[PDB]
Swiss-Prot record, chain A:
Descriptive protein name: Small ribosomal subunit protein mS37
Localization: Mitochondrion; Nucleus
Motif Cx9C motif 1: chain residues: 43-53
Family: Belongs to the mitochondrion-specific ribosomal protein mS37 family.
Species: Homo sapiens (Human)
Superkingdom per UniProt: Eukaryota
Residue range from the parent sequence: 3 to 60 of 118
Subunit structure: Component of the mitochondrial small ribosomal subunit (mt-SSU). Mature mammalian 55S mitochondrial ribosomes consist of a small (28S) and a large (39S) subunit. The 28S small subunit contains a 12S ribosomal RNA (12S mt-rRNA) and 30 different proteins. The 39S large subunit contains a 16S rRNA (16S mt-rRNA), a copy of mitochondrial valine transfer RNA (mt-tRNA(Val)), which plays an integral structural role, and 52 different proteins.
Swiss-Prot record, chain B:
Source species: Homo sapiens (Human)
Implicated disorder: Combined oxidative phosphorylation deficiency 47: An autosomal recessive, multisystemic, mitochondrial disorder characterized by intrauterine growth retardation, swallowing difficulties with failure to thrive, hypoglycemia, dehydration, and hepatomegaly. Additional features include global developmental delay with impaired intellectual development and absent speech, microcephaly, facial dysmorphism, cataract, sensorineural deafness, skeletal features, and cryptorchidism.
Source superkingdom: Eukaryota
One Gene Ontology term of the molecular function aspect: RNA binding
Phosphoprotein recorded as keyword: yes
Family to which the UniProt record says this protein belongs: Belongs to the bacterial ribosomal protein bS1 family.
Protein name as annotated: Small ribosomal subunit protein bS1m
């Protein structure tokens, strides 16, 4: 796990901040939803074979 | 001549053990939930171990088992928490039965 010592801008931290999170680095009591995978067009290769055969066979 | 608490703690077997990592202890099963065995080995917290495939029926309530302790209590502090999150159970590996 990456270190957080001296990263955020805080009192007593002399160096300029390393991380600038837009949300507090605090664990929530929930996880993200089961994100769906965007469907891709399927059977394109077989469709191509069929269409090429159609073109060759009128 | 009443023994003091410091004397009891100094000579207690748990103190004599030292660190609990890789220490063989003798636990007693006190509760069984399907294949989960809840074993008390004299520590503050019990351990939960899966019933072994071999001699599974040989593990019953009151059985004495040989455990290899990894930690007396499973605690870990996480991102942003102010206190260590504890699951209120130990971490031990169930070796087998002691005769």
């Amino acid at each position: 796990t990456p270190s957080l010592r001296g990263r955020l801008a805080r009192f007593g931290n002399p160096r300029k901040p390393v991380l600038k999170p837009n949300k507090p680095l605090i664990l929530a009591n929930r996880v993200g939803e089961r994100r769906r995978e965007k469907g891709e067009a399927t059977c394109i290769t077989e469709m191509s074979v069929m269409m090429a055969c159609w073109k060759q066979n009128e | 001549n009443v023994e003091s608490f410091a004397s009891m703690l100094r000579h207690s077997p748990l103190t004599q053990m030292g660190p609990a990592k890789d220490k063989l202890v003798i636990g007693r099963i006190f509760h069984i939930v399907e294949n989960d065995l809840y074993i008390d080995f004299g520590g503050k917290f019990h351990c939960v171990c899966r019933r072994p495939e071999v001699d599974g029926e040989k593990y019953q309530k009151g059985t004495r088992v040989r455990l290899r302790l990894l930690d007396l209590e499973l605690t870990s502090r996480f991102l942003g928490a102010t206190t260590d999150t504890t699951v209120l159970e130990a971490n031990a590996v169930l070796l087998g039965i002691q005769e």
